[PDB]
Design a protein around this ligand. Sequence first.
Ligand SMILES: Nc1cccc2cc3ccccc3cc12
Ligand SMILES: Nc1cccc2cc3ccccc3cc12
Lengths: 155, 159
Amino acid sequence: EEEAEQNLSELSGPWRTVYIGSTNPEKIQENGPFRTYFRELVFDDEKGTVDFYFSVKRDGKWKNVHVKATKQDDGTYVADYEGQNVFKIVSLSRTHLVAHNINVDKHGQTTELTELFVKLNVEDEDLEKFWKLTEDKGIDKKNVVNFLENENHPH
Amino acid sequence: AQEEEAEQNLSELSGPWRTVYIGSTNPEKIQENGPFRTYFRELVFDDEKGTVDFYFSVKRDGKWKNVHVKATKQDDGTYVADYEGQNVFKIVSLSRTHLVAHNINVDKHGQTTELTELFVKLNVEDEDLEKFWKLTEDKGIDKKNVVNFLENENHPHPE
Ligand SMILES: Nc1cccc2cc3ccccc3cc12
Ligand SMILES: Nc1cccc2cc3ccccc3cc12
């Protein structure tokens, strides 16, 4: 019985959007800039940054977007995306993230958003059980597809 | 006496699941446009009827399809289901977060293919859901202005 050491960087990896709420419905409606499907998040304790990787559909087509947020002294984060954003992490753990974002667009319009995201965790022993079974059945490693990375890098 | 009955309570594990890895003795079956290149979405276990409903997506002929398959348990402990032929699969390892399975498929030409798979569950805890709803209520956001991204038709394509 063992568990990996807790590190903020250990939180990095595949994450998925569960719910997103908005004070302005238009921002999260179809073709809205904040109807974001998360792919991955990367936390960097040293630089005080969080890199966001998500997909959003615009003009009827899906786009992959990357946004880097920078932490401030007050613990909040700032990021440039469809205007200026100030993001606060309300709750964070190995499996979930609840955040509050304040966005002010190119027209001075303010929108507040809430979100719940969940992390997809793949444990070491589960991976080992999969590979053992795979080799027991005589399946070549090149005959294995990684669906998770496909979902994390869509098109 | 052979083995004894197994106290089975998997109803608990129902919910959103995702495909991590799928291996195959026949690469054609899981290559692009392959029938088993299946992206899981949801799994529902019924302990009383002894079944498992699979909800997944697969790309066929350049087109995405949402598929629903019902599997039925057997005295054997394995499950059988019809999908691109006859299937007999076994759950090798299972927990609140992962599923490792072995499936044997025989297509319409009698060809036998063995597949292995690792799937992970997307667990949404009540404590976290409550935190989200409280925060959402605090920001004066109406429940109708909240979008569910777990169960939504309009989503990105993995390929
Ligand atoms: N700072 C941000 C940058 C890009 C997308 C975001 C999407 C969000 C969704 C819910 C709550 C906060 C969010 C912050 C975001
Ligand atoms: N019963 C099933 C129906 C449809 C696709 C499946 C894909 C699988 C992949 C690896 C192991 C078992 C599988 C069972 C499947």
